[model samples]
Target: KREYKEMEGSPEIKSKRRQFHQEIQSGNMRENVKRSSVVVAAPTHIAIGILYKRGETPLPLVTFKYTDAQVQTVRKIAEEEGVPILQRIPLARALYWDALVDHYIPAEQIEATAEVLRWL
Candidate 1:
């Protein structure tokens, strides 16, 4: 993960920091986290465990451009391994947004999680 560099004696840096904190502290980030539907099929839990366990280090950005066969293979493998295949991008987007933004969702509206988790 790249550290948020603070500009020496710069007001902009302070402002940007404050804004970032506000967005995150206001419970805005975790509003719509959902489980992925893309099932991950593996011979053992350890195989799929790497992805979840690897913490951000410049946070990995995986951009998939799957062919039809690849997509089918992903779904097949996921089902075989008992992992859910997340087909919808919105849910994934929301999850990414929350991770990037680091904001917590309002507890009162926790159900909003479903709004972003569903396959639309």
Candidate 2:
């Protein structure tokens, strides 16, 4: 979270705001989330985060994955940020390996994702 004391009528602020807008509009925000371990899904026995973006490749681009060791950290961050948490092993498993993070979850998991979003 980047905060500015005064962002009104500032050229630099305007420029940066424009850049931020473009980033969000262009799906860069999802890329950043995918880049972070703070967001992931857990199956019955494991948690995973899928790191990828649309049009980058034919298959999912998983930079890495997180497991039991990082589950606490992920939960802690999500708690601090007041993000919603959902529990669905099957859904989580599919999302863990195949979905494109939040930006591109599979159609079947859309309802689960919507439930999570609803919590927000």
Candidate 3:
């Protein structure tokens, strides 16, 4: 059987995250968790990072889901972009979004296109 696990952010950083979550007036703490989750779809990775404004300003509550096929596409682009596939959750999400927006990849196909890219 295949086993998958979610990545955990530092427990020590809880207080910092709490402060940010408390500041937001949306029901998105869960969205943050969903996006940060390892088992989630590909677009969620990029959408979550963009929603949280994980690295930038005017962060909006952007939330989207992708298919398994879409995630494989994202993985390849992540490789091409030199994004650390095994890096921390935040970086992974950032890389996901960077590849998405930069490549103009459709949210759903992000994972599927990955295979096509490899063969092309």
TM per candidate comes to: 0.28, 0.43, 0.24
Q: Which candidate gets the maximum TM-score versus the true structure? A: 2
Sort the predicted structures by lDDT, highest score first. Answer: 2, 3, 1
Put down candidate 2 lDDT per residue, 1-120, tens digits, no spaces.
222223255666645644453344323333333354334466335444433334663323222234575556555555665533456577567655443322334455557655544453
Candidate 3: stretches off by over 4 Å: 1-56, 60-64, 84-120
What RMSD, rounded to one decimal, does every model reach?
13.5, 14.8, 14.9
Model 1, residue 11: displacement in angstroms?
Answer: 29
Tens-digit per-residue lDDT, 6-30, candidate 3: 1334644534443443355243334
Say which prediction, candidate 1 or candidate 2, comes out ahead on lDDT: 2
lDDT of 1 at 29: 13
List per-prediction Cα lDDT, in the order shown.
0.32, 0.45, 0.33
Higher-TM-score candidate of 1 and 3: 1
User: Of models 1 and 2, which has the larger TM-score?
Assistant: 2
- Model 1 spans > 4 angstroms off: 1-50, 54-64, 90-120
| Weakest lDDT window of 10 consecutive positions for candidate 1 | 44-53
